[PDB]
Amino acid sequence: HSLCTCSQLHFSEETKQVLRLSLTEFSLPKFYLLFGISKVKSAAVIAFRSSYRDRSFSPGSYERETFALTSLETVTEALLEIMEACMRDIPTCKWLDQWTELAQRFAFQYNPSLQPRALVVFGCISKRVSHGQIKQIIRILSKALESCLKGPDTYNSQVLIEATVIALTKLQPLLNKDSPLHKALFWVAVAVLQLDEVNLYSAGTALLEQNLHTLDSLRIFNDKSPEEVFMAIRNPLEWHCKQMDHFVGLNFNSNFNFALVGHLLKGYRHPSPAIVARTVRILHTLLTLVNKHRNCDKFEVNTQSVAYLAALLTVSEEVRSRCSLKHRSNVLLDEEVLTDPKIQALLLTVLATLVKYTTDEFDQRILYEYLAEASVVFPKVFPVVHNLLDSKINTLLSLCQDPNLLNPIHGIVQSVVYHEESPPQYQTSYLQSFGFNGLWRFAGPFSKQTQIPDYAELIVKFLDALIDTYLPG
Amino acid sequence: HRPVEWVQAVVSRFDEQLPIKTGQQNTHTKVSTEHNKECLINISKYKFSLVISGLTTILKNVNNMRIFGEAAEKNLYLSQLIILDTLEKCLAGQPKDTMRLDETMLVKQLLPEICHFLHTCREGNQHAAELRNSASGVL
């Protein structure tokens, strides 16, 4: 309000309209929640007390809401919009350059109460970043992880990690167009999804989504495929990467697309309905890039572009229509192209996993129809999908009372017995042989007992090696 | 390993829909329980020995059951009717495998229970008439 009613400054008639809209916005019920005073009809009344001379204040209801560093961005970006509007008129203003210096001092200095908040603000306002700055941010994340496992106080240092990731999500689009880290920040995003926490997972996708968006505008996927780009830059530090893949139960050398999809499938289990739609977008953007490399109309089915179509099967209508089951354009599960035993063992584990945890009538219907047709078209490899289907099918047979959902299940039972009476060619442990022994485990729900899985001792070493190779000094 | 245990579920649910057994309103207008029959008939083609053996025990238990009341008798009459009708379809449905190595089941499990109905069975003037016609087709 003081800005709109100040005479020292001469704001043009355009700017004064910007401020007046901001004045009304901040009084909306949306911003009462951001500031943390929801359930308060008016702020003025609570701020002041009438009997302020007679008696002292009497605080109560010590129950105190929490704060989320995502809220701080929304406020921190509303203010930054106001300030820039002013600087257009005020010549040679120094407001933004003074504010940045204040943030940059607390951002890189150890203070467990102010550092997390000073990183979310340093990135939201800064206009230039250098390589020397990025290393400090990436080395605050390395020290944050080590503290978590050593001590028993996690939540204290699990907000200094989410703040380091949020900073990087904003500072990447300002880096130099020819820096290696434009591509090496795809493994930080991947290495963060493996920590199994809703907040860390939520921030990890936000870095990944814009990592693809930025690389597109630089035209780096023009003549190469995702597997080529990210797997080429991982080579110098392959020794450290390999060890992580062993324990997480996924492999990236054997099959890239499926390993990448494995992490993204957990997004469907996130409590917030806003992170579910973000992991769907990351799948489309990856699908349109692999197909463009092969010039295959964006909906063709091949070995490379089959993994991202099973994930979109139950959420994207165009995929279901353009890829229809033969036993009602082209039909998924074609045995002409999917003629590799491995490439067809995984595609069944993806489908079994999506139904083991799903709870929805419309979803279970579509996924079971694609499993019945799989029983006949792929008789030999189907026995590697029993334990995943063992428990839930047994329950459905006993108590299900839906003809639409009970039909496909019966077709599966008949197929199993028909092709039985032969020595199992592929055992249940066929997947552990070539790496993917943890694929079904990694897609479970987020654990209520939030704790670092304790194989984070390797993520520290990987990050440390990443700095040494690409930021020598 | 697992699929053998899957068949048991189809068979086990069959008993829980017999009128004499507590209905529990699981019929769902009989569409849900009728689908179970079609699967059970189909499964017999490849697991004939297992399905047939399970059916005999289900029939044997019903025979060795004592119940009183007009409703009780009516339920048991309709109960045994379903088992026999299903059992006959499996035999007729089964292709001409001509496997003559079912002696074990026939001698003890199956024949004694079918033979019982062929007796005069004067319990019901109208019920026994239908049972013989259905039982005779099985034999």
Phi, psi of A360 (to 5 degrees): -170, 135
Cα(B16)–Cα(B4) distance, integer angstroms = 20
Cα(A374)–Cα(A381) distance, integer angstroms = 9
Q: Classify burial at A261, counting beta carbons within 10 Å of its beta carbon; exposed 0-12, middle 13-18, buried 19 or more.
A: buried
Residues whose CB falls within 8 Å of the CB of residue B25, separated by 6 or more in sequence, listed in order:
none
Closest among A393, A392, A375 to A384, alpha carbons compared: A375
Q: Which of residues 354-413 of A touch B (CB under 8 A)?
A: 386-387, 390, 393-394, 397-398, 400-403, 406-407, 410, 413
Maximum Cα interatomic distance, chain B, rounded to a whole number of Å: 48
C-alpha distances (whole Å) from B130 to each of A292, A309, B67, B134 are 71, 57, 21, 6
Put simply, the answer to whether B2 touches A387 (Cβ < 8 Å) is yes
Cα(B76)–Cα(B81) distance, integer angstroms = 8
Put simply, whether A427 touches B (Cβ < 8 Å) is no
Candidates B5, B32, B46; nearest CB to A417: B46
Candidates B1, B5, B42; nearest CB to A414: B42
Put simply, whether B38 touches A (Cβ < 8 Å) is yes
Experimental method of this PDB entry: cryo-EM
Closest among A104, A103, A71, A97 to A83, alpha carbons compared: A97
C-alpha distances (whole Å) from A308 to each of A71, A281, A443, B94 are 32, 11, 15, 44
Minimum Cα–Cα distance from B41: chain A residue: A414
Report which residue type is found at A21: L
Cα(B7)–Cα(B45) distance, integer angstroms = 13
Put simply, whether B35 touches A (Cβ < 8 Å) is yes
Contacts of B38 in chain A (CB under 8 A): 410
CA angle, residues A281, A308, A331, in degrees to nearest 5: 120
List of long-range contacts for B121-127, beta carbons under 8 Å, 24+ apart:
B124/B73, B124/B77, B127/B77
Maximum Cα interatomic distance, chain A, rounded to a whole number of Å: 92
DSSP three-state, residue A249: coil
Question: How big is chain B by its Cα radius of gyration, in Å?
Answer: 15
CA angle, residues A162, A283, A245, in degrees to nearest 5: 60
Cα(B106)–Cα(B84) distance, integer angstroms = 15
Cα(B51)–Cα(A347) distance, integer angstroms = 33
Residue A126 tokens read as: 């800064």
Helix, strand and coil in chain A, % to nearest 5: 65, 0, 35
Residue A61 tokens read as: 């209801």
Candidates B1, B28, B35; nearest CB to A410: B35
Q: Classify burial at A165, counting beta carbons within 10 Å of its beta carbon; exposed 0-12, middle 13-18, buried 19 or more.
A: buried
> Are A168 and A185 contacting, i.e. CB atoms less than 8 angstroms apart?
yes
Residues whose CB falls within 8 Å of the CB of residue A94, separated by 6 or more in sequence, listed in order:
none
Put simply, whether B18 touches A (Cβ < 8 Å) is no
Cα(A276)–Cα(A267) distance, integer angstroms = 6
Cα(A313)–Cα(A332) distance, integer angstroms = 10
Cα(A64)–Cα(A83) distance, integer angstroms = 31
- A269 to chain B, minimum CA–CA distance in Å? 28
Stated in angstroms to one decimal place, the resolution of this structure is: 3.4
Q: In which residue are the tokens 């899985």 written?
A: A453
Helix (H) or strand (E) holding A280: helix A273-294
Q: In which residue are the tokens 């019903």 written?
A: B62
> Are A440 and A388 contacting, i.e. CB atoms less than 8 angstroms apart?
yes
Cα(A47)–Cα(A211) distance, integer angstroms = 43
Cα(A272)–Cα(A269) distance, integer angstroms = 9
Cα(B68)–Cα(B70) distance, integer angstroms = 7
> Are A417 and B49 contacting, i.e. CB atoms less than 8 angstroms apart?
no
Residues whose CB falls within 8 Å of the CB of residue B53, separated by 6 or more in sequence, listed in order:
B105, B109
Report which residue type is found at B131: L
DSSP-assigned letter for residue A304 = G
Cα(A324)–Cα(A333) distance, integer angstroms = 9
> Are A197 and A158 contacting, i.e. CB atoms less than 8 angstroms apart?
yes
> Are A200 and A192 contacting, i.e. CB atoms less than 8 angstroms apart?
yes
Helix (H) or strand (E) holding A31: helix A29-35
> Are A14 and A86 contacting, i.e. CB atoms less than 8 angstroms apart?
no
C-alpha distances (whole Å) from A405 to each of A85, A311, A392, B66 are 59, 21, 13, 38
Cα(B67)–Cα(B32) distance, integer angstroms = 27
Q: How many CA atoms lie within 13 A of A174 on its CB side?
A: 16
> Are A439 and A431 contacting, i.e. CB atoms less than 8 angstroms apart?
yes
- A123 to chain B, minimum CA–CA distance in Å? 55
- A427 to chain B, minimum CA–CA distance in Å? 12
Helix (H) or strand (E) holding A404: helix A403-418
Residue A235 tokens read as: 């080579």
Closest among B46, B99, B12 to A416, alpha carbons compared: B46
Cα(B117)–Cα(B119) distance, integer angstroms = 5
How many CB contacts within 8 angstroms connect chain A with chain B? Answer: 51
> Are A428 and B53 contacting, i.e. CB atoms less than 8 angstroms apart?
no
> Are A165 and A204 contacting, i.e. CB atoms less than 8 angstroms apart?
yes
> Are A206 and A167 contacting, i.e. CB atoms less than 8 angstroms apart?
no
Contacts of B42 in chain A (CB under 8 A): 410, 414
Cα(A26)–Cα(A190) distance, integer angstroms = 37
Sign of CA dihedral A121, A124, A130, A134: positive
Q: How many CA atoms lie within 13 A of A88 on its CB side?
A: 12
Helix, strand and coil in chain B, % to nearest 5: 70, 0, 30
Candidates B3, B26, B39; nearest CB to A416: B3
Closest among B20, B55, B13, B54 to B34, alpha carbons compared: B13
Report which residue type is found at A6: C
Provide the H-helix boundaries in A218-360.
226-233, 238-248, 256-264, 273-294, 307-311, 317-322, 341-357
Helix (H) or strand (E) holding A157: none
DSSP-assigned letter for residue B129 = H
DSSP three-state, residue B7: helix
Helices A403-418 and B2-15 pack at an angle, to 10 degrees, of 130
